[PDB]
Amino acid sequence: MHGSNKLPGFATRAIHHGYDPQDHGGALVPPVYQTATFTFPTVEYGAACFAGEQAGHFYSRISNPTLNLLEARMASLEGGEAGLALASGMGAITSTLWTLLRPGDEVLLGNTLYGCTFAFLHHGIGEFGVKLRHVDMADLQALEAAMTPATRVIYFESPANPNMHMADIAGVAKIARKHGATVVVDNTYCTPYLQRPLELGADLVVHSATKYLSGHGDITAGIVVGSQALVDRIRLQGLKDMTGAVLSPHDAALLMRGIKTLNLRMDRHCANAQVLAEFLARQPQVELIHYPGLASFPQYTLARQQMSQPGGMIAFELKGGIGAGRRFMNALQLFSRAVSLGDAESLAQHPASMTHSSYTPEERAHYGISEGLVRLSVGLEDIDDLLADVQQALKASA
Amino acid sequence: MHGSNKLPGFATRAIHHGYDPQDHGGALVPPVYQTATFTFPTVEYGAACFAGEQAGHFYSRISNPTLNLLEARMASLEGGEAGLALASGMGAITSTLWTLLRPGDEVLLGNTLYGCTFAFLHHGIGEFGVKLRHVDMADLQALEAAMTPATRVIYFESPANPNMHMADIAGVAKIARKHGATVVVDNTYCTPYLQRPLELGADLVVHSATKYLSGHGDITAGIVVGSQALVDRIRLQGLKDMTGAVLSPHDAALLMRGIKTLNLRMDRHCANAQVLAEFLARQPQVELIHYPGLASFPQYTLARQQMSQPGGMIAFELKGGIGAGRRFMNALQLFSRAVSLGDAESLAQHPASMTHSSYTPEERAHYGISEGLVRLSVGLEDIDDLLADVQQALKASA
Amino acid sequence: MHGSNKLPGFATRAIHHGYDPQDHGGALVPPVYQTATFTFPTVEYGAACFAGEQAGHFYSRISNPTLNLLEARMASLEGGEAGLALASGMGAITSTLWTLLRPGDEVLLGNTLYGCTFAFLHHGIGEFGVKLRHVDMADLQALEAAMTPATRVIYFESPANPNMHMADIAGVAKIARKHGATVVVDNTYCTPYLQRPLELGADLVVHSATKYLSGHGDITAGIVVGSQALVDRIRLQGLKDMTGAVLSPHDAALLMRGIKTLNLRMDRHCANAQVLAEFLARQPQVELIHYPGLASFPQYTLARQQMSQPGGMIAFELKGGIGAGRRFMNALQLFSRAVSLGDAESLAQHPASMTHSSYTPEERAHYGISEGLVRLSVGLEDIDDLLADVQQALKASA
Amino acid sequence: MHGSNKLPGFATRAIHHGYDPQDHGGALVPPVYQTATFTFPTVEYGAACFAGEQAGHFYSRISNPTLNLLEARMASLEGGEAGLALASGMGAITSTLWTLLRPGDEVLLGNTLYGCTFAFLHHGIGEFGVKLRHVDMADLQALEAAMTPATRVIYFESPANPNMHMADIAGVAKIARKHGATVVVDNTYCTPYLQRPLELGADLVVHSATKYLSGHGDITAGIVVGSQALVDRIRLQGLKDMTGAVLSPHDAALLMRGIKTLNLRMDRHCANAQVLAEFLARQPQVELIHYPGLASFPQYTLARQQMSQPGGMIAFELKGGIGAGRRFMNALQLFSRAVSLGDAESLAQHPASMTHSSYTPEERAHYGISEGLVRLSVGLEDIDDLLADVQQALKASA
């Protein structure tokens, strides 16, 4: 029965914020409102909480009670005014963009983006009259120059794959402020616990709660956090009309549960990541590592200004090419070969031989897809087991 | 374990189709794959699993096993090639159209659509360059007229609101074929058990499984059934990139549980509605009555040519206007005042005083929504009980 | 919403009994209180609760809200004052007996009992000083004869395997009524829909809701209904201290869900049974058939005065004994080979070759089980599909 | 690694043991087998199963595949041979005691036992011919002086409320292997991460997974781990026949989720309670503190021997008695007033005013309840937030 008072700690808010059992029969854990619609005592009441002149419910695709908790709790974590829960990370971004953008508008994106966010942009909204421009969100000079009066939205992820490149959120925020552009940042990798873009200036944050937020890989979910005005626009339009990405109260309840241990889990993802990154840094097979924890990381100072810890994500270039990458991934025994991250279990991936095994060294390299770059999502397993696993894979990657 | 499709009876396929317990450890009820990621044995299996070389999964937003069973089964019930499961009715509607339509194309709409479907059409894709035109899909003379070399898809619901107005599905299917347009019908009200648009000529059918299909109002879900080529494209583009309206295995399984009693539940709905319609008709308080089961139904004959049964939705207009309606609704004890339909629970709504209450007799007239229009979604309760509520509520309407 | 008071019809009460959305934020379907503990606003309240002075909760093992509804509902349907939900049918049986019996007490039992109920009495509570005596409850002169001052309770099922042998509930209650014994009936096969033993005189009724109540075979649950006085003891003694067979509210919800279509499902189970039982009757390969629906049924008159419908379970004997039954069973394609009943899916089982393959012709025989007796739990599939599966199988049983 | 092959650490087994996705369609999170019955391909196979000659399932009450992994995992965590899941903690102890005891047998019990298990023993099995006697399990001489040829089981909690009194598990275990008797340790409080009785000589461990194991108070479950032999006996007798406390695969899947973060949460719980215990040790209002972490704790050494960490429970007495206990309790703002423990939410309780508020000081003392003893279950919230709550409450107690 806290979170919402003066200023309870992060971990106290990710557990209590927004809920007092005294308001729900005393149920310690909040009841799950797994219902599609709600009823009214009078046609007059219905009308009231239909026109917004009243606080109530009537249909879950619009707003649900258990969903309103996750949302309220998530907003408090990112330090925003309000949040909206959705069916998936793509439901969050597509819902945001579909209502913020219109034909003739221009949107500036980071030089790199999450595959489906790229496809959506260049083959989805991008083919419905909206303008796209990929700029270096770390290059403020270039950002300012790329700005036009048609610029409505600035969208990027920080950090961004594959080299965990970082952006200057507070600087971008400033430019967009002068020009009147809305800043949207994908904060799946850090979570509200490791980085809070809204405080650095960004206007809205989108998450793929499917990853770190759920932390157990058993639900697909997305989240949006920003001003009431903005989230309200996105709730009444993007999600309801243009997208139907409605989140199941059950999954929302599952999300809210995985969040009750967000700080602990993140603490552990980073810890295992730090020692693994440094262990990777002494092997002659690894010729380059992309991890914010190492001081040799190009944007070390910028990373440590925005991020609380270097995150539990690392990537490196195996000296040996695509063949070594294949051998390295085929030899892994604890690290699972799959796509995704933020799971308790350790995941690893070699895009050059997996998601891009079709292309050519010439084309894959064109997309900035290194030939021997493998990426791992360090889980909550015992480092010893982890170090041992990649240790043998390396001996096999040769 | 018999669902040979087309051959085994409906009820038989609604329970077994697509599943043999022998293939899943003898599990009578299929295991729910509440997972987000799927891992590979090697990076070469992942590659083939990405280059369409190998059959398998890797991420539940693209495709999930539990959803695949739900999908295959729905397909069988509609006599369709392939199905697609989504987070809600609007996830299917928007996911379908977002991929079939582009800027410059035109789409012919049925006079009346679902509130949100109208909003998405007119304030969604519409504001992105797609041309819209409403045409009485029952008038084939006008349809043929309205056709153009640019009309890409014909979209409508049958029956439709606010009077259960039907369309000539095979009629427009023939026209759409000559010109080369895609007919997609919203078969929500009927369910594949009362009508199979695909067999009448339609190309795609979208469903709001939130209603009759789930039948118990505890989940929100949508469904798209059509040709393998059409559905594959909608999966790989509409859902994957532009909507992300992913359905949660937990809900998809609840839906498959509801479907298992589709026929039984739809029979009671139709049986109960008929009796109420009969009654409402002879009522002095009733000015007009819209129930496809009455021999006076304008389109009685057409209805029985497309619908195996009259469905369980009924609409009627009170002579006293908004006043009567407000009093009628407020006096209801067994019927619930709310939106939606298709629950074991009987739902009743009065637009002029609820959803469209913020209006005035202005458009309420322009939209065909009489001040006395009342829509009833007859549940499965005891008809004796439902009649006393309507009867009692009728007397209070005075 | 219509409560009980026994006025609203069975179908109304089995859907709305004891629930008013208005009292729960207007949620059509009750929110599921999936929580282990409930908090107190003050220490006083918590106390007043523990002292019954105040009504509320504290621990979901003694009393949970979600389960409470289910319990108020099942009592209504059964026509008793109180109900109680447990982890399983056995958890209900054992909990009831574990609290009504003590060393020296005597239990008069029906001749044939469900496997685990038998093993429970003879190898469970039986090895703790409780005397067990099997009697033919259809014979009142025999029962009254076995009646002794130490007889504390009378337990039986009606109908009971292997040939749905019936009992005279009202007559038994009379004998028990005069001596002071407690009558408890396992009403699993009939459900409150087809038979209400409480209305005939029984003191307590038990159910394996893992069957017809759920009707969808995805949960195992138990139910007990009877007076407030008796049930309270079972909850606060049998459930709480012994067995501790607590039901998950998730499962309780799934159960109230399947119950919403109880009458519809039972109506079909029986219609399919009658036809199937009449088709087997005309078969020369079948020697004897046990179905309360056939006019030849031995207790056909007693059956029709206690049950509103013959039910959905069938047992019959093949002329070719063992081998005919094995070949038949091993040939079935739509019916499944499995224990259990009350599922939407049709199940079949041949003791002589499955559960009792262990025994010998003599053993089984001298144990009640013929060599060619097979039991079918007719499902909701299409009758012609079911009939053609038994037909094909009968021919393969040559 | 990826289980318990390459002698994986605890955190690694807590999330990987017993499961390899490459065996279940590559699913990262194992599919939930929410099914009651399992079918067979031939009657023969079914016979095999029923007998035990063929590996498989046929009914979940006996054994379910999702529960098998929960069981197998726990077995690894506790370092045991086999495990079993039950509907609840009580379901675990009763199911266990009901199968290892018969009239004429004697069971030696620790001096203090959990409220319900005491009632169970003294008003359940106890009234069924079983002889029970309490002996201080920290006093090996008295324990041995109590061993009789009739002694069959030694059952104790360690630590045990209300003062966290310990017992020499290796000690009583050695006395047992000598005088027969089976050792059953209720290891709920410490979990297999903080204490492993099996590795000290215990025969079985019962768990109220409803607490720390679950971790989030949304489940009620129990766990038993020990030798295949003893465990196989409890499965096929206590579970199956005398208890029926079946676990829902839903909750068993949920519980396996919480276990995925056991080490992490357990660490915070302990690090949190220490600080809190230290702080309580310096306040004028506190008369006595029972925390195994305080160097002043009577069994400090022995605790340090068996428990890897001091745990998360803290009991203490207020010089002010009940009055001081009520005001301090009623004054709590972050801690919640409720029974139970092991949740991410901090809970507190004062027996003298809640559960025993009705008894007189005499009665209370004649049971083991102090007039000013309050028990605190320290959650995972923020320590600074927790200190502040207790601080003001302590002040409110004047």
From Swiss-Prot, chains A, B, C, D:
Please report the name of this protein according to its UniProt entry: L-methionine gamma-lyase
Give UniProt keywords alphabetically: Lyase, Pyridoxal phosphate
- Which terms in the Gene Ontology molecular function aspect does this entry carry? homocysteine desulfhydrase activity; methionine gamma-lyase activity; pyridoxal phosphate binding
Q: Binding positions for substrate?
A: 114, 375
Q: Transmembrane ranges?
A: none
Which superkingdom is the protein from?
Bacteria
| Cofactor names | pyridoxal 5'-phosphate
Tell me the impact of changing residue 241 to H/R: 5 to 14-fold reduction in alpha,gamma-elimination activity against L-methionine, while no change in affinity for L-methionine
The record lists pyridoxal 5'-phosphate as bound by 59-61, 89-90, 208-210
Query: What phylogenetic lineage does the species belong to?
Result: Bacteria, Pseudomonadati, Pseudomonadota, Gammaproteobacteria, Pseudomonadales
What Pfam families does the annotation carry? Cys_Met_Meta_PP (PF01053)
How might one describe the regulation of this protein's activity?
Irreversibly inactivated by DL-propargylglycine.
- Known InterPro entries for this protein? Cys/Met-Metab_PyrdxlP-dep_enz, Cys_met_metab_PP, L-Met_gamma_lys, PyrdxlP-dep_Trfase, PyrdxlP-dep_Trfase_major, PyrdxlP-dep_Trfase_small
Applied use = The recombinant MGL protein cloned form P.putida has been found to have antitumor efficacy in vitro and in vivo. PEGylated MGL is being developed as a cancer drug.
Q: Which GO terms describe its cellular component?
A: cytoplasm
Gene3D superfamilies, per database record: Aspartate Aminotransferase, domain 1, Type I PLP-dependent aspartate aminotransferase-like (Major domain)
Q: How does it assemble?
A: Homotetramer; dimer of active dimers.
Q: Which BP terms in the Gene Ontology apply to this protein?
A: transsulfuration
Keyword Zinc-finger on this protein? no
Q: Which residues carry this modification: N6-(pyridoxal phosphate)lysine?
A: 211
